[PDB]
Ligand SMILES: CC(C)(COP(=O)(O)OP(=O)(O)OC[C@H]1O[C@@H](n2cnc3c(N)ncnc32)[C@H](O)[C@@H]1OP(=O)(O)O)[C@@H](O)C(=O)NCCC(=O)NCCS
Ligand SMILES: CC(C)(COP(=O)(O)OP(=O)(O)OC[C@H]1O[C@@H](n2cnc3c(N)ncnc32)[C@H](O)[C@@H]1OP(=O)(O)O)[C@@H](O)C(=O)NCCC(=O)NCCS
Ligand SMILES: CC(C)(COP(=O)(O)OP(=O)(O)OC[C@H]1O[C@@H](n2cnc3c(N)ncnc32)[C@H](O)[C@@H]1OP(=O)(O)O)[C@@H](O)C(=O)NCCC(=O)NCCS
Ligand SMILES: Cc1cn([C@H]2C[C@H](O)[C@@H](COP(=O)(O)OP(=O)(O)O)O2)c(=O)[nH]c1=O
Ligand SMILES: Cc1cn([C@H]2C[C@H](O)[C@@H](COP(=O)(O)OP(=O)(O)O)O2)c(=O)[nH]c1=O
Ligand SMILES: Cc1cn([C@H]2C[C@H](O)[C@@H](COP(=O)(O)OP(=O)(O)O)O2)c(=O)[nH]c1=O
């Protein structure tokens with residue numbers, strides 16, 4: 349079979365805005381859809397979680413198990429950005445240093461949250477099993493390899509790997525031509 | 535909207551025990567509820583799996599996709615200990631050496647199950663995508679980085695990172711004061 | 721427990737399927753008509769099977785494991801098991817910047833990497849691991865946890881790392897044990 353909402357059920361969800369050809373699995377979780385926005389030709393697979401301010405452009409695959417903890421400051425993805433399975437992107441994290449208490453259970457005034465908008469520029473691919481922390485921009489046409497971790501903004505058009513990531517080599521810009529060629533025949 | 539049980543439904547699950555202000559997603563999986571006790575101010579998110587022997591104290595977040603398999607020896611977590619998304623704590627793990635058959639499709643004679651209780655002491659924080667193997671004491675105040683793997687027990691108030699983890703710096707103890715400051719005003 | 725009844729299962733429509741095959745109701749099966757399962761097989765909560773998967777016998781597919789069979793398929797031999805939160809890909813999008821990617825985009829603009837994934841006998845894949853397309857995991861190999869595998873792996877070794885490196889011989893005791901269990905089945 350397949351797991352997706354129909355254009356009908358989509359509409360009843362109460363999204364800030366949702367495009368056309370949007371396939372979201374009923375096996376995903378959508379928290380606070382009133383601030384979640386989806387452009388066109390998007391797919392979100394089983395067991396993803398979207399919570400808080402999330403904005404996705406058009407022609408993005410969010411693969412299974414991927415969590416987007418958009419918070420109040422948000423996560424945004426430009427067009428042709430894609431995220432492989434089991435990725436987490438965080439717009440807000442707790443403070444591990446030992447200088448604060450943490451998580452939901454604890455009153456704000458004792459915490460020390462790290463928070464910043466997270467943006468994923470065009471043509472970003474995020475490898476399977478990766479993590480992106482708050483306040484970072486992943487640069488235009490960056491690929492980040494599998495099982496990688498990102499704590500900082502990434503320079504455009506490079507491939508990064510590792511925990512935390514290191515720049516391994518350039519990203520081909522050939523996606524750009526194709527983007528245009530594809531867009532042409534629309 | 536949230537996916538959590540009403541206190542009504544909670545009790546019709548029947549845990550060895552279960553405190554108050556305890557939010558557990560309906561999208562989580564609780565097996566063997568009668569071997570799980572749960573304190574107060576505790577939250578378990580979508581897609582988690584609790585299995586068998588699990589003891590959770592008070593003031594704890596267990597983030598989504600987290601699996602606690604406590605089989606018979608169990609997992610025990612103190613107060614103010616937290617677990618980030620997508621972690622596994624294993625109280626029992628198969629012998630990988632070549633010397634044994636494995637998993638639930640096989641009789642136990644042909645198996646060499648390494649088992650051993652897992653404890654996470656006050657203020658432990660496990661970061662996301664982490665694994666804890668059996669027979670491990672995560673000392674009080676220990677922070678383990680995201681995408682870390684833990685085989686040995688670990689020293690109080692330190693920060694560990696890697697696969698397998700290694701010690702990289704002392705955790706601050708100021709959270710001691712804040713615990714106090716905080717329980718103080720109740 | 722989570723599993724489908726024997727009645728519930730023959731209702732899914734698996735190409736083939738055997739007996740004592742416990743499958744969680746919280747796992748996701750896609751195109752069951754191209755998925756054969758042997759006997760004594762466990763698939764836990766939140767797994768995803770999609771496309772050509774063949775699984776033999778005495779196998780555990782731990783919680784959260786995704787097997788993306790595609791056309792080419794993923795094949796496991798008997799006594800192979802996979803641990804929680806693993807991903808097996810028989811197809812994957814070229815990352816180089818030489819092509820677009822995803823089901824959002826028409827086939828011509830992509831440069832999809834494809835190939836059979838075979839998990840031979842006694843294979844054990846550790847937890848949180850990723851295995852790529854066109855990859856033969858050799859007989860009685862163990863890959864550790866959090867491991868990444870992009871090329872074929874030689875018989876009877878332990879492998880760890882991202883990407884994997886060979887670390888030690890895996891012991892073959894397991895083969896005698898196998899025989900002993902199989903005989904104890906007969907007499
Ligand atoms: C990052 C990636 C694209 C690089 O592939 P590549 O161009 O073949 O690069 P190579 O395999 O030659 O390796 C280059 C270096 O990076 C390392 N490396 C490659 N992938 C890595 C990863 N995910 N994490 C850490 N290191 C990695 C290799 O060790 C090698 O190291 P060295 O330079 O010290 O020898 C690929 O390894 C990858 O991670 N793909 C993820 C696939 C995915 O997530 N798919 C989801 C479904 S579509
Ligand atoms: C543990 C952590 C807090 C430490 O970061 P930090 O205090 O800023 O210290 P640094 O980032 O300078 O890291 C120190 C070193 O460890 C390495 N390192 C840091 N985090 C690592 C990790 N998770 N795994 C492997 N290595 C890590 C870095 O390469 C650096 O190496 P070096 O000693 O060769 O320079 C952070 O990196 C981390 O892993 N956080 C997890 C957060 C999380 O899981 N959040 C879930 C949402 S609440
Ligand atoms: C693969 C495994 C069995 C190897 O364990 P081992 O035989 O105890 O080997 P050791 O602990 O001596 O370590 C061998 C080396 O590999 C490294 N290593 C071990 N496991 C690793 C892993 N998963 N990833 C990366 N490196 C690893 C160690 O740092 C050590 O390094 P060195 O030789 O360079 O000093 C074990 O490490 C493991 O990962 N088991 C996974 C368990 C699991 O996934 N279980 C599912 C539950 S049923
Ligand atoms: C992975 C996945 C697939 N499916 C369905 C829709 C897809 O068209 C079909 C198989 O697609 P998929 O498994 O993503 O492979 P492909 O790359 O060929 O699209 O199964 C879901 O409904 N939900 C899911 O989470
Ligand atoms: C992640 C998650 C959120 N929610 C709901 C309940 C929470 O009150 C709300 C906020 O979730 P969350 O994303 O954890 O935000 P915060 O970090 O501010 O708590 O979303 C669930 O019900 N289940 C979940 O698994
Ligand atoms: C982990 C898990 C357990 N269960 C059920 C079946 C088991 O009888 C019981 C305990 O499971 P588990 O912790 O897997 O025990 P074992 O090590 O014996 O396999 O809970 C599921 O249905 N699905 C799951 O994903």
Ligand SMILES: [Cl-]
Pocket residue numbers: 413434599620784805
């Ligand atoms: Cl997961």
